[PDB]
């Protein structure tokens, strides 16, 4: 894994004329880990004492542990020697299945009358919001997976603005093949999202589909649909909306959009 580093060592060692903030912004993506380093004598509030964004309440929670909002994150805080100084190391490891979170860390030297602060901003969120369906050769099925990965609609603490909670999967319909929509393991999925896909697919009478099974796995619910043969071209968009689905204390879901392309061209 690659590592993103914010090293403040021997850079918060002056008395400024006016209030000064030295800022390190991190946008960790490809499973990257994070190291924050600063002199031991600095006052540091980080990871187990961070400022975390709370999408549900649209505010920031101060002096809190990031594990309360992204439970699969794990970090260690050690004293190390670095650049010839006694320093503190904040080492956060981000596994592939860790959920989104937006938090900040503060680093304040003493005896500067509070005029100088270091700040780390860690914004962990998805950056691919559109994919094509993926063929599972072992199961002989095309899958749109909204239960994990890039198109996950599970409620999370990710910093998303109100108009940016859409994720999209495109399925080029193959006649007589089973198609799977994987969704989070939540009661709301069968209560409301399943009516949503049924009303979407049945709205146009000329669309041939068969709902085969509503299946509950170990960590997802799947809608299993077979589309029959067709002749004419058609594009059908369905929305499975959890962008307003709340989950205490801070989580909000996303909107899963599925685009069915019916085409005998190309």
């Amino acid at each position, epitope marked *: 894994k690659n590592i993103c580093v*914010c090293d403040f060592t021997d850079k918060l*060692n002056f008395l400024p*004329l006016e209030k*000064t903030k030295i800022l390190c912004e991190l946008k960790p993506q490809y499973g990257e880990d994070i190291k924050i380093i600063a002199n031991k004598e600095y006052e540091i509030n980080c990871m187990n004492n961070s400022k975390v964004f709370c999408p549900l309440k649209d505010t920031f929670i101060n002096n809190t542990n990031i594990k309360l909002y992204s439970p699969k994150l794990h970090f260690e805080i050690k004293d190390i020697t670095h650049k010839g100084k006694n320093a503190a190391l904040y080492y956060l490891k981000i596994d592939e299945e860790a959920s989104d979170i937006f938090f900040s860390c503060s680093i304040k030297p003493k005896q500067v009358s509070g005029l100088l602060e270091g700040e780390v901003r860690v914004n962990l969120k998805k950056h691919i919001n559109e994919e094509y369906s993926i063929f599972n050769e072992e199961e002989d099925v095309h899958v749109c997976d909204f239960s994990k990965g890039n198109l996950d609609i599970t409620p999370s603490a990710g910093f998303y603005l109100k108009n940016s909670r859409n994720v999209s999967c495109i399925y080029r319909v193959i006649p007589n093949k089973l198609f799977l929509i994987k969704l989070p393991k939540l009661d709301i999925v069968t209560e409301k999202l399943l009516p949503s896909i049924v009303n979407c697919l049945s709205e146009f009478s000329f669309i041939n589909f068969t709902l085969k099974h509503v299946q509950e796995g170990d960590n997802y619910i799947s809608f299993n649909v077979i589309f029959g043969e067709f002749k004419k071209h058609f594009n059908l968009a369905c929305s499975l909306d959890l962008s307003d689905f709340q989950q205490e204390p801070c989580n909000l879901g996303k909107t899963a959009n599925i685009t069915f392309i019916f085409s005998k061209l190309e």
Partner: nanobody
Amino acid sequence: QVQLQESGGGLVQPGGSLRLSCAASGSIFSTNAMGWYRQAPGKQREQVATITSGSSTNYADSVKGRFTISRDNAKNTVYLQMNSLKPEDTAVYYCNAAGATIDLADFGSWGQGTQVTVSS
């Protein structure tokens, strides 16, 4: 990585003048505020003068009217003109980024600095 190189220090008599220079590389110089800093033995490093990308200046109260900070965007250099020097001005002088909000990537590891000694 930002690289900083100060020069121009030396021994000067009280009341004399001195001009410090600092060459900065590794960043887009003309978009950054810059500043001069100094540290004497047993004192904490202090920001002495700052200059915005738009050439607005600010000074520590103890050097107001005696020091002048300037910049040459074409050469990526910051200057500190010091007149009416006092023994209390004796320190190692450093330049670096300044500003109210500074990207950590723009704040370079401190250069070697240049020594200024004001004594008879």
